[PDB]
Amino acid sequence: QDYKVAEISLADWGRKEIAIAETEMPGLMALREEFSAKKPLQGARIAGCLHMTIQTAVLIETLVALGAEVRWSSCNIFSTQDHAASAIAAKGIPVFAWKGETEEEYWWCVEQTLSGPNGWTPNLLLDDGGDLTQVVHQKHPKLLTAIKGVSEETTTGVARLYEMAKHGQLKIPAINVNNAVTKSKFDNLYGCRESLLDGLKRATDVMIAGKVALILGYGDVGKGCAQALRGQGATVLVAEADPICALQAAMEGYRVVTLDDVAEQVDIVVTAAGNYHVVTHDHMKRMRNQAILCNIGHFDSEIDIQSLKQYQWENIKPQVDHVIFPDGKRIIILAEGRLVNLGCATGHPSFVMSASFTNQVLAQIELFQNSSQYQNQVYVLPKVLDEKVARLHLGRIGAKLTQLSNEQADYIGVDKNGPYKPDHYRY
Amino acid sequence: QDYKVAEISLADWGRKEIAIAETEMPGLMALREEFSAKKPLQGARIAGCLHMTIQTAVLIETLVALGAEVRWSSCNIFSTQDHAASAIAAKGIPVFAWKGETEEEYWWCVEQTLSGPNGWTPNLLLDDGGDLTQVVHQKHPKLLTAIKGVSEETTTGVARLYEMAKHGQLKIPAINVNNAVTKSKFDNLYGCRESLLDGLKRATDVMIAGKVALILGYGDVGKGCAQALRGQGATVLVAEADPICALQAAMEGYRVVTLDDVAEQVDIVVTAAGNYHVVTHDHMKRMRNQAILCNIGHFDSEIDIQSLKQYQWENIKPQVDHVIFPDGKRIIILAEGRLVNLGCATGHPSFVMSASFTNQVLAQIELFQNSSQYQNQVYVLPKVLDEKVARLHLGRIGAKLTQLSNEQADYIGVDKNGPYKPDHYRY
Ligand SMILES: NC(=O)c1ccc[n+]([C@@H]2O[C@H](COP(=O)([O-])OP(=O)(O)OC[C@H]3O[C@@H](n4cnc5c(N)ncnc54)[C@H](O)[C@@H]3O)[C@@H](O)[C@H]2O)c1
Ligand SMILES: NC(=O)c1ccc[n+]([C@@H]2O[C@H](COP(=O)([O-])OP(=O)(O)OC[C@H]3O[C@@H](n4cnc5c(N)ncnc54)[C@H](O)[C@@H]3O)[C@@H](O)[C@H]2O)c1
Ligand SMILES: Nc1ncnc2c1ncn2[C@@H]1O[C@H](CO)[C@@H](O)[C@H]1O
Ligand SMILES: Nc1ncnc2c1ncn2[C@@H]1O[C@H](CO)[C@@H](O)[C@H]1O
């Protein structure tokens, strides 16, 4: 029993949804077709810390199909889909993950990925948020020597990598997967455009139309969140500290405001900043009865949930809580301030996760084979691989590329087969 | 009479609209307030080749207010606003520009900016499309030695600069103004979102709702063009050679198609590719009666207009022509295949042009003062100046920035005053 999941009998349900998801994830299935015979990951031993969803199940089985051995944990206490974890466990793949972990169980799960029977230890890390990278660096420095590198999924995780590199604390090569174009501009944006609304609806069933919704942060995540609620008839407000992002939001028709000014006016608050206490106690005290607060950024401290411990909490249903102020006023807190799309729904849909996870597999292949040519710094995959990820997803959604003629390729200074853009291109 | 314009008596009308535009261009007016006393451009002699519009008039007078002497020409034969040129000429500023220049008049106008009375010669170039840069390099190499650098406005122009640098043909420093974030992601995108529709309507008065419109190219320009027509109820098709840009368009709900497939289906065709003959004779032969074709990319060869010389052309009104095929079928060609927003309307509105032109002024200041620390390569302005451009435009449209606290700045690794993003950030 080299696994730990909530209920193993959910395996067959997990398997059925994984079968569906495979048809939504052509990038991963294309990598299996291209590489399953050559097994480029034979000899790879991957410790993974990434939301144990149906989509991640397809990622795991792609790594295994390419020859890898893996041990897996989720990177959020609420993000596991128990039936996905059970389907993976039933294949004999070590997974330590369930929805609703305590803090202690969470770190125990991560630790289980770092050693396996017969002296199994990872030579690769696959991380989403930097927790696994931190544990290894801080608590298992002997394991560091054997680790060829880490590939990192999300914006907050890559920020932690850059802080480490700035102070000489990064001891392994790192591939920034977030800043592949086919990740940051798809997952972060179009993923949240669908899964923010999903989390809100499943949790509260709230009408979006006519509501005043505030998005704190207008980066890739906040951009998608704004589109989502705007499409359903909300008046969308945006807060930003970056004047360029603020000008973008203003040019899309959003009023750019501070929560200091508008706290009494909002029905729904979404933190998308990757920052600390952007929603304070005073903000929440000023909010109307039954205001809905959630966080779609990576950590639980975008909202100061600590400041709410002084009040009575009344649970409505799992991951949906009332906080009752002394005058009787209530606010609704989603997922105890943690990732609302994964905590209250199922995260992003399979199709866009295929783009993110095709980048992950390519990074693991590149680290496994060529980590010796990398320094202890953070890199991105080259554009030719970024474009390949895009190409592998066009067929599913019926998009037909125009082929450049010789003179057209020459005219704009590109090879007919790409890359089509200079490295400084922002899309 | 050190100028050449269509009708000098239009000056007072030009002056009235320039006065209005100043209130729409807070970035330029802010630079005047900050720098008009210190005159950082005293001693600067700027030859400019850039659409002689009301907006460019505000740019010119900002350069002059900062101490510069300029000589100006337009970079398109149809893009001049005659009343803007007349207002500039009436100030005593040398301008050589009118709407409807012949090819010979066009290059004569450019040449006039390269020498003035009393042995006046430029020490700076301000270019939009690379024509002035080409003329100097190819036909005035003695003038090159005195030129401190060029600042270049648009995507096609910077591509020409990179081709030059790749072959050792660039002999002066160049600042890529297009790829300031506050240019490429605002001018190219939101500018075209309004001025493409403007050009189409003024030229043809065509209903957009219910039409099938094809956008060739889904870069910054094509992205804005698509939004424009989609907002007015067109079915918008997109063609792309770049799989990443294609996937973006598909994820916004556009069918990504080839003109080879859909020629019989389109009512309106817009080339936004910066490429050569993306619309061919056979495409146009297959199009329905009264199909509308236009180009919003920088040069007249996105559509093969040459292939239409074999047919009878019947003018409808200035810059709006019928091409009559042998079977009686007609197509409508806008502006002889040249920039439709500037040829058939007035280009982008003042507010977004203020963002582009605030970057231009900063680049000219940086070249004038520090060109000796630059090599003969193409550079961009640093992010701190990019963010300053954004800041200077927030007040006009009522956007209020959130100020980071000390711990929030530290938490994401930035200075409270910026820059807020790493150089690889794509917005
Ligand atoms: N839930 C998901 O599925 C998912 C997906 C991708 C990323 N994320 C996470 O979401 C967060 C945001 O990611 P991103 O890619 O959008 O980052 P980003 O850097 O592109 O955008 C964050 C924005 O927040 C703004 N901001 C920071 N502090 C602020 C403050 N106090 N007030 C207002 N605005 C402020 C910044 O100016 C920036 O524009 C990260 O923590 C990332 O890991 C979650
Ligand atoms: N009219 C204006 O006011 C205005 C403003 C800005 C830029 N421009 C001009 O517009 C052009 C496009 O600028 P941009 O910033 O969008 O460039 P971009 O590079 O961002 O976008 C151009 C796109 O065209 C695509 N493409 C190239 N050849 C193609 C083909 N044969 N078929 C289909 N797609 C093809 C490329 O893949 C690319 O995505 C340039 O010439 C630029 O100078 C005009
Ligand atoms: N359904 C999902 N399965 C796995 N990871 C997901 C899912 N939805 C979002 N994520 C990831 O969560 C990360 C933030 O922790 C994002 O960068 C995104 O890739
Ligand atoms: N109204 C306008 N005045 C001046 N330049 C403009 C205007 N509209 C668009 N342009 C410029 O035309 C360039 C293409 O030649 C674009 O990069 C854009 O900056």
Supply the DSSP string of A363-381, one letter for each residue: HHHHHHHHGGG--SSEE--
Q: Do residues A253 and A226 touch, judged by C-beta distance below 8 A?
A: no
Burial class (CB in 10 A: 0-12, 13-18, 19+), A415: exposed
CA-nearest residue, atom 13 of ligand 4: B154
Helix (H) or strand (E) segment spanning residue B389 = helix B383-394
Q: State whether the beta carbon of B356 lies less than 6 angstroms from ligand 4.
A: yes
Helix (H) or strand (E) segment spanning residue A124 = strand A124-127
Cα of A339 from ligand 3 centre, angstroms = 10
Residue A379 CB-half CA count within 13 A: 21
Q: Which residues line ligand 1 (CB under 6 A)?
A: A 154-156, 188, 191-192, 216-222, 239-242, 245, 272-275, 278, 296-298, 339, 341, 347-348; B 402, 404, 408, 412, 420
d(CA B184, CA B224): 11
Q: Please give the sequence-ordered ranges of beta strands (E in DSSP) within B62-170, or none if there are none.
A: 69-73, 95-96, 124-127, 150-152
Q: Do residues B29 and B22 touch, judged by C-beta distance below 8 A?
A: yes
Distance (Å) of CA A101 to CA A109, A263, B65: 9, 32, 65
Cα of B274 from ligand 2 centre, angstroms = 4
Measured between beta carbons, the chain A residues lying within 8 angstroms of B279 are none
Closest CA to B213 of B300, B272, B297: B272
Interchain proximity B402–A162, CB inside 8 Å: no
SS3 B168: coil
The two structure tokens encoding residue B292:
């509308």
Q: What are φ and ψ of residue A307, in 5° steps? A: -65, -10
Q: Tokens 């019947």 belong to which residue? A: B314
Q: Do residues A312 and A288 touch, judged by C-beta distance below 8 A?
A: no
Closest CA to B251 of A86, A20, A223, A276: A223
* DSSP sequence for B1-21: ---B-S-GGGHHHHHHHHHHH
Helices within A8-140 (DSSP H only): 11-23, 26-35, 54-65, 82-90, 103-112, 131-139
Interchain proximity B247–A186, CB inside 8 Å: yes
Specify the experimental method: X-ray
Q: Which of B17, B24, B55, B74 is catalytic?
A: B74
Q: Do residues B379 and B178 touch, judged by C-beta distance below 8 A?
A: no
Measured between beta carbons, the chain B residues lying within 8 angstroms of A426 are 179, 181, 184-185, 426-427
Cα of A347 from ligand 3 centre, angstroms = 6
Q: In sequence order, which residues have a C-beta less than 8 Å from that of residue B410 and are 6 or more positions away?
A: none
Q: How far is CA A3 from the centre of its chain?
A: 23
The two structure tokens encoding residue A58:
């397809």
User: Of ligand 3's atoms, which has the minimum distance to the CA of residue A356?
Assistant: 19
Torsion sign, CA atoms A248, A250, A253, A254: positive
Q: Which residues line ligand 3 (CB under 6 A)?
A: A 51, 53, 55-56, 128-129, 153-154, 187, 191, 298, 342, 346-348, 353, 356
B404: left (phi over 0), alpha (psi -120 to 50) or beta: beta
Q: What are φ and ψ of residue B22, in 5° steps? A: -55, -40
Measured between beta carbons, the chain A residues lying within 8 angstroms of B407 are 276-277
Amino acid letter, residue B323 = V
Length of chain A: 427
Length of chain B: 427
Torsion sign, CA atoms B5, B11, B13, B18: positive
The two structure tokens encoding residue A334:
């989603």
SS3 B79: coil
Closest CA to B160 of B186, B134, B181, B189: B134
Torsion sign, CA atoms A74, A80, A86, A88: negative
Q: For chain A, how far is it from start to end, CA to CA, in angstroms?
A: 47
Measured between beta carbons, the chain A residues lying within 8 angstroms of B247 are 182, 186, 355, 390, 393-394, 399
Interchain proximity B185–A404, CB inside 8 Å: no
Distance (Å) of CA A192 to CA A269, A424, B230: 15, 25, 22
Question: Smallest CA–CA separation between A94 and chain B, in Å?
Answer: 34
d(CA B385, CA B390): 9
Q: Tokens 């501070």 belong to which residue? A: A258
Cα of A11 from ligand 3 centre, angstroms = 21
Helix (H) or strand (E) segment spanning residue A96 = strand A95-96
Measured between beta carbons, the chain A residues lying within 8 angstroms of B190 are 251
Q: Do residues A246 and A238 touch, judged by C-beta distance below 8 A?
A: yes
Q: What are φ and ψ of residue A165, in 5° steps? A: -60, -35
Helix (H) or strand (E) segment spanning residue A315 = strand A312-317
User: CA nearest A252 in B: which residue?
Assistant: B190
Torsion sign, CA atoms B204, B207, B211, B213: positive
Q: Tokens 């790192």 belong to which residue? A: A174
Burial class (CB in 10 A: 0-12, 13-18, 19+), A4: middle
d(CA B353, CA B191): 8
Q: In sequence order, which residues have a C-beta less than 8 Å from that of residue A411 and are 6 or more positions away?
A: B275, B276
Q: Do residues A246 and A228 touch, judged by C-beta distance below 8 A?
A: no
Q: Can you list the domains of chain B with their CATH numbers?
A: 8-185+348-391 (3.40.50.1480), 190-344 (3.40.50.720)
Question: Smallest CA–CA separation between B34 and chain A, in Å?
Answer: 19
d(CA B281, CA B374): 45
Record the resolution, in angstroms: 1.9
d(CA B186, CA A244): 10
Interchain proximity A400–B251, CB inside 8 Å: no
Closest CA to B25 of B187, B178, B185: B187
Distance (Å) of CA A232 to CA A172, A235, A236: 45, 9, 10
Q: Do residues A300 and A337 touch, judged by C-beta distance below 8 A?
A: yes
Beta-carbon count within 10 A of B114 CB:
19
CA-nearest residue, atom 16 of ligand 4: B154
Strands of the sheet with A150-152, listed across from one edge: A95-96, A69-73, A45-49, A124-127, A150-152, A174-176, A378-379
Buried b (16+ CB within 10 A) or exposed e, B308-322: beebeeeeeeebbbe
SS3 B157: helix
Distance (Å) of CA A261 to CA A213, A249, A256, A285, B50: 14, 18, 11, 13, 43
The two structure tokens encoding residue A369:
């084979």
Beta-carbon count within 10 A of B20 CB:
11
Interchain proximity A242–B404, CB inside 8 Å: no
Q: Please give the sequence-ordered ranges of beta strands (E in DSSP) within B31-109, or none if there are none.
A: 45-49, 69-73, 95-96
SS3 A320: strand
Q: Please give the sequence-ordered ranges of beta strands (E in DSSP) within A227-267, or none if there are none.
A: 235-239, 255-256
User: Of ligand 4's atoms, which has the minimum distance to the CA of residue B183?
Assistant: 19
Paired with B203 in beta bridges are none
Q: Are strands B291-295 and B330-334 parallel, antiparallel or unpaired?
A: parallel
Q: For chain B, how far is it from start to end, CA to CA, in angstroms?
A: 47
Strands of the sheet with A255-256, listed across from one edge: A255-256, A235-239, A212-216, A268-271, A291-295, A330-334, A320-324, A312-317
